[PDB]
Design a protein around this ligand. Structure first.
Ligand SMILES: [K+]
Ligand SMILES: [K+]
Ligand SMILES: [K+]
Ligand SMILES: [K+]
Ligand SMILES: [K+]
Ligand SMILES: [K+]
Ligand SMILES: [K+]
Ligand SMILES: [Mg+2]
Ligand SMILES: [Mg+2]
Ligand SMILES: [Mg+2]
Ligand SMILES: [Mg+2]
Ligand SMILES: [Mg+2]
Ligand SMILES: [Mg+2]
Ligand SMILES: [Mg+2]
Ligand SMILES: [Mg+2]
Ligand SMILES: [Mg+2]
Ligand SMILES: [Mg+2]
Ligand SMILES: [Mg+2]
Ligand SMILES: [Mg+2]
Ligand SMILES: [Mg+2]
Ligand SMILES: [Mg+2]
Ligand SMILES: [Mg+2]
Ligand SMILES: [Mg+2]
Ligand SMILES: [Mg+2]
Lengths: 131, 88, 59, 92, 300, 31, 101, 151, 75
RNA sequence: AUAAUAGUAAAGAUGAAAUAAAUAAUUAUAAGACUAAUAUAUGUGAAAAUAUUAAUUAAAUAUUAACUGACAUUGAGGGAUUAAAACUAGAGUAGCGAAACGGAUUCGAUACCCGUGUAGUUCUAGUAGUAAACUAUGAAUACAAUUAUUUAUAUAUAUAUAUAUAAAUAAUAAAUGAAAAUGAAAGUAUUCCACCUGAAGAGUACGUUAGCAAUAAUGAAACUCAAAACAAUAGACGG
């Protein structure tokens, strides 16, 4: 099944804002590819201010690095990833939504589909045939 | 053909029964399972009238017997306890 | 058999374009039964049933 | 450090609630009127009053049904009045 | 038969129109057909419609949408004022000219493919001119076309290897050119939007040909003077020209050097006074509007 | 049946409930 | 006074045709009465054919359909179809749960 | 490295219930040497400046002005209590920095407080008020309210 | 893991652009032109992302019986 | 609820009242229950029910193609599910709240209003099978005159509407009806099931079956009476 993870990582060090996000993406990506899974895309969303002050593991946060990760795995692996994210102190909020593949095998991230690009081939073919 | 319909229902019955064994309080899908099992009985009862030779061949291959098909069945609480549907 | 179709079809197309005849090919001539290594032998190793269906449907 | 000092203005107003008005030093009574409009367009006074006492779900459903009917009935009434006025203007 | 007669009846001649009779947007041209009744028929509320128009109506001109409705009334507005805008334009005797120097749309000119060198610009305009098309009916232009174009694959898999084989073995820069031409050549026979609904030229506002001089008892008229009104007392924001109301049209007025002092004096009531203007040129835009340029002739 | 008529059944049900509570109480003391 | 409130004067666009009635107060009142946000469709993503549920991670677009306090607007105000209103509300509720809106 | 407590603004909070009106005047104090402390992260600094400590200066109710029992929840009680607050803010030299008014509920004293601040009684305080806001607390489901009163 | 390390570096790099969704960025046809060309040309297409026509012509001795035909014509 | 902080002297409640370093404000911590807008319960579900988010499993739509060849309808008995309250066992217990104990009101107040608030309301595993469990309207099939409004599928184009065919809802013709009204049924017909035969006695008594229990199902007769009931009409009256 195709899944879309949206994680809000903590920005502890203002000098290295995209450090825990890179370390986290590697941890999650390794779980996926080591359990028969495929990582289709990793779309960084940048530092954004949280809608409110949020709390996690007796800590407070006002900003986080947003990142998206489109990956293919089994339901058991998807639940394992979610369990690790809900326990990691780095992760402030994490959501995994299923992306239906009943009609087509290649679906882009919701962010891209919102912009009209329905498949990764459309994104790649707009970076080769026109770039 | 009635034999094909019974076989196709058997696959779904087997899958639905496995679901119920893990979701014993899912009464909505227990009701669906009951109706599907009763539908399979109806199609096979017609087959026995239409082509008796195929009927006996079909039920033997599916693992059923004439009694399972002709006898009134309600998949009630006594059945769940006499055949240990949920185990223990 | 670690040998893969793609790799085997990449040796029958390089040996047929370079002239090399390592014993692997003889083995490949047994893995697939393709005694002769020509451009019209890889095309018959990769035939898909769909192609036959398309012609039966036209008839 | 100063990085945490020069980035507090937006941060302060980035977590807004939507129930605040910047007072117009000239006409300070116009800002209180603007705040009142927000309260009524978010039904804040009505919600607060409706949360003072518990109402049974059946009664809640009845009131919601009746209120919707009255809202739709008023829209149908206004549509018919517009037709009357237009018909009168053309001499019907 | 009765059906044949009905198709040719005067009511059938009026094209179906459901456009709002009360429109508050920007009006660039007439939207409804003006209906006129003679004085004798008006005395009897006869307009050639289904039902008698209410006697309150004293005008002899109306515009309507529906002959009858569920409300048992006719949907009409007793106005015919777009005819006076056209007749006032005729009185100003300013021919409409093309700012792009295009051929006259009212003459059957022998045109050539000079602009047809943009075959890939307009052949794809059929699928790319979908600014306001449904999200799925426009998507039906992708599979429906793909099958039609895919049915010409065999024809183009032989013509291209018989007329330009070198390109197929060297580069596709020219192959793409042969593709755009192929479809158009095989589409000119087809009828895709064979009827074009775009406004043709002036749209009927003026059928006057440029060139003629206006003879007068005081000699040939060299500059057309027309009374008008200045709407704003401050030039259009971001534009170096004010706006005037001349003959039912809003024009852009250019002043000689300075703005008359009556502007500051009058202020927002400047529209209450009438000035004399000179109509420099009149152009037609694709939206169907008329771009009238004027000049505030001031007593000197 | 109307509310008026329902009220007669209501009274009969109340008197039966009142009598059964009364009987219960006695059994408790007599037990 | 040489000044008039904008609400008491109509500015005729350039290139448009007008009637004498366009200078009256009736035109002013008539334009107020029939002033509807009909140009929203061309600027309304959710009235274009896109699935509102694909915007659950784009709070900026979703924030156009909630009040200042975050209350989802009734369909009477949004003007969306039943399906889009249903999908849009789901997107907003999901966005709120993820921690973005 | 040294406590440098300074006032940044004042908060005038009004709680307008059905039976009383409570008016609190507070000071938003900021230790201007907080960033000069050791072992302080960028997050702790930003979190300290996003919710600065507050100190209560004036606390008033309608019973402090002599209104008793049922009179405490009336319009006149709130208007006079609002005046006494606007006076005590000038008599304590607390009208130098900007004031932010926070109103809580919609009792009869809410409109009296607004009238007393947009009128003569609050002509000094109103000049310093920079932001007005509402802080009415609503519940999304939450605890069960008491049963409706049959009266 | 090699692909993962290369992807992470290329996406979380200062040079890389990140979808911050703060403004309506400005600029279909590209992907629609690849479809049109692959529908007309088919096997004899120049698109990097071709259709099954090319794979069908290969296994049907068409892309080869046409290459020889073109070359024979050139002769 | 607890703690801190400054800051004070009243606070809380009501028709008005009185009963039990505060209230208010800003922080921090803990716990249980609930689910604002959207929202129409629209829709979905056999009914009961069902609206904070995600995931897993199961079920559910339309058209087309092929296939089976009456395999269907209804359904006694039977089976399954079934709100709230109640009960058994173990956890939980913020708020609400039978009872109980107090404060008021009143001529009296075993009430309505206020306080303190136990069971219960929550979760897990069970028992029980009852509601104005209501559309007070069993299910299925064939059929009959219109309009309006949505929804869905399809078709077309001079590309955004237009034309079709279903479904839903609203108002109706006919028809039906004691009328109120029903309106695609409460119409025209067919098939199957449940149920009724004056009121009161009575859904009671007795027996039986089932349940830990409360109870649930089944379910009379005597005596007495010439009543009793529904729709609608005109009044009178209404804090
Ligand atoms: K419903
Ligand atoms: K037969
Ligand atoms: K039967
Ligand atoms: K039965
Ligand atoms: K409790
Ligand atoms: K009901
Ligand atoms: K029945
Ligand atoms: Mg059956
Ligand atoms: Mg009855
Ligand atoms: Mg009071
Ligand atoms: Mg209580
Ligand atoms: Mg407190
Ligand atoms: Mg809700
Ligand atoms: Mg419904
Ligand atoms: Mg049945
Ligand atoms: Mg217990
Ligand atoms: Mg009490
Ligand atoms: Mg049970
Ligand atoms: Mg009972
Ligand atoms: Mg019953
Ligand atoms: Mg119910
Ligand atoms: Mg059925
Ligand atoms: Mg009983
Ligand atoms: Mg009656």
């Amino acid at each position: 099944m195709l899944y879309e993870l949206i994680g809000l990582v903590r920005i502890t060090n203002s000098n290295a804002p995209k450090l825990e996000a890179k370390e986290l993406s590697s941890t999650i990506g390794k779980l996926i590819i080591q359990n028969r899974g495929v990582v289709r895309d990793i779309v960084p969303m940048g530092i954004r201010y949280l809608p409110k002050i949020m709390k996690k593991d007796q800590e407070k946060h006002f900003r986080a690095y947003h990142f998206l990760m489109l990956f293919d795995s089994s339901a058991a692996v998807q639940s394992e990833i979610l369990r690790t994210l809900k326990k990691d102190p780095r992760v402030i909020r994490s959501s995994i939504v299923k992306v239906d593949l009943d009609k087509q095998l290649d679906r882009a991230s919701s962010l891209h589909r919102s912009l009209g690009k329905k498949s990764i081939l459309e994104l790649v073919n707009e970076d080769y045939q026109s770039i | 053909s009635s034999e094909v319909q019974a076989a196709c229902m058997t696959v779904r019955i087997q899958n639905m029964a496995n679901h119920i064994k893990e979701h014993r309080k899912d009464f909505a899908n227990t009701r669906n399972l009951r109706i599907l099992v009763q539908q399979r009985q109806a199609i096979l009862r017609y087959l026995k009238r239409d082509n008796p030779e195929k009927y006996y061949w079909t039920i033997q291959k599916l693992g059923l017997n004439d009694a399972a098909i002709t006898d009134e069945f309600n998949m009630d609480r006594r059945y769940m306890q006499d055949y240990e549907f949920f185990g223990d | 058999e670690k040998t893969t179709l793609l790799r085997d079809i990449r040796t029958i197309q390089d040996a047929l374009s370079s002239g090399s005849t390592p014993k692997e090919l003889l083995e490949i001539k047994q893995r697939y039964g393709i005694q002769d290594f020509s451009q019209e032998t890889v095309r018959q190793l990769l035939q898909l049933d769909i192609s036959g269906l398309e012609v039966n449907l036209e008839k | 450090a100063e990085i945490a000092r020069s980035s507090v203005e937006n941060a302060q107003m980035r977590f807004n609630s939507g129930k605040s008005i910047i007072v117009n030093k000239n006409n300070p009574a116009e800002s209180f009127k603007r705040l009142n409009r927000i309260m009524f367009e978010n039904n804040i006074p009505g919600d607060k009053r409706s949360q003072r006492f518990y109402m049974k779900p059946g009664k809640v459903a009845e009131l919601k049904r009746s209120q919707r009917h009255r809202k739709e009935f008023m829209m149908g009434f206004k549509r018919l009045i517009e037709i009357v006025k237009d018909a009168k203007r053309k001499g019907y | 038969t009765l059906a044949e007669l009905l198709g040719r009846s005067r009511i059938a001649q009026v094209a179906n129109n459901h456009k709002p009779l009360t429109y508050t947007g920007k009006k660039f041209h007439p939207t409804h057909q003006i209906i006129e009744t003679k004085p004798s028929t008006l005395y009897r509320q006869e307009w050639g419609l289904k039902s008698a128009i209410p006697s309150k109506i004293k005008s002899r001109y109306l515009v309507y949408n529906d002959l009858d409705t569920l409300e048992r009334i006719t949907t009409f507005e007793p106005r015919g004022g777009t005819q006076w805008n056209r007749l006032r334009f005729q009185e100003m005797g300013v021919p409409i000219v093309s700012n792009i120097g295009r051929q006259n749309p009212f003459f059957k000119y022998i045109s050539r493919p000079e602009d047809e060198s943009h075959a890939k610009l307009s052949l794809f305009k059929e699928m790319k001119g979908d600014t306001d098309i449904s999200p799925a009916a426009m998507k039906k232009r992708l599979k429906k076309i793909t099958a039609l174009i895919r049915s010409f694959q065999d024809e183009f898999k032989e013509w291209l290897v018989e007329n330009h084989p070198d390109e197929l073995k060297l580069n596709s820069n020219k192959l793409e050119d042969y593709v755009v031409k192929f479809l158009n050549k095989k589409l000119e026979t087809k009828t895709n939007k064979k009827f074009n609904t775009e406004i043709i030229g002036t749209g009927g506002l003026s059928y006057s040909l440029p060139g003629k001089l206006k003879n007068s008892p005081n000699g040939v008229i060299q500059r057309t003077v027309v009374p008008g009104r200045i709407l704003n007392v401050v030039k259009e924001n971001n534009d170096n020209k004010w706006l005037a109301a001349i003959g039912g049209f809003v024009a852009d007025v250019v002043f000689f050097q300075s703005p008359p002092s009556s502007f500051n004096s009058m202020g927002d009531f400047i529209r209450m006074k009438t000035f004399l203007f000179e109509i420099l040129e009149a152009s037609m835009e694709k939206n169907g509007s008329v771009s009238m340029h004027a000049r505030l002739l001031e007593p000197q | 049946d109307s509310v008026m008529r329902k009220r007669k059944k209501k009274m009969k049900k109340h008197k039966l409930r009142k009598r059964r509570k009364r009987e219960k109480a006695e059994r408790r003391k007599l037990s | 006074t040489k000044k008039i409130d904008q609400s008491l004067s109509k500015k005729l666009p350039k290139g448009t045709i007008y009637d004498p009635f366009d200078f009256s107060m009736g035109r002013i009142h008539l334009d107020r009465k029939y002033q509807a946000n009909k140009n929203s469709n061309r600027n309304d993503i959710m009235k274009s054919g896109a699935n509102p549920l694909e915007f659950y991670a784009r709070p900026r677009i979703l924030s156009r359909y909630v009040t200042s306090t975050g209350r989802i607007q009734h369909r009477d105000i949004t003007g969306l179809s039943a399906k889009n209103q249903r999908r849009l509300s789901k997107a907003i509720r999901r966005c709120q749960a993820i921690g973005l809106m | 490295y040294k406590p440098k407590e300074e006032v940044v603004k004042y908060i005038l909070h009004g709680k307008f219930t059905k039976n009383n009106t409570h008016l609190t005047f507070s000071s938003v104090v900021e230790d201007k040497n907080f960033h000069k402390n050791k072992g302080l992260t960028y997050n702790d600094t930003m979190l300290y400046y996003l919710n600065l400590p507050q100190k209560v200066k004036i606390s008033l109710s309608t019973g402090c002005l002599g209104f008793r029992k049922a009179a405490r929840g009336e319009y006149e009680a709130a208007f006079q209590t609002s005046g006494r607050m606007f006076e005590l803010i000038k008599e304590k030299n607390m009208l130098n920095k900007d004031i932010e008014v926070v109103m809580d509920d919609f009792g009869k004293g809410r409109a009296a407080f607004i009238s007393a601040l947009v009128g003569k009684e609050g002509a000094s305080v109103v000049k310093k008020v920079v932001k007005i806001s509402d802080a009415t607390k609503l519940k999304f489901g939450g605890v069960r309210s008491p049963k409706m009163r049959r009266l | 893991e090699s692909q993962l390390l290369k992807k992470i570096d290329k996406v979380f790099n200062d040079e890389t652009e990140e979808f911050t969704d703060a403004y309506d960025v400005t600029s279909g046809n590209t992907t629609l032109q690849t479809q049109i060309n692959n529908a007309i040309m088919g096997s004899l297409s120049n698109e990097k992302f071709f259709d099954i026509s090319l794979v069908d012509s290969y296994l049907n001795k068409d892309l080869k019986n046409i290459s020889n035909k073109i070359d024979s014509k050139l002769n």
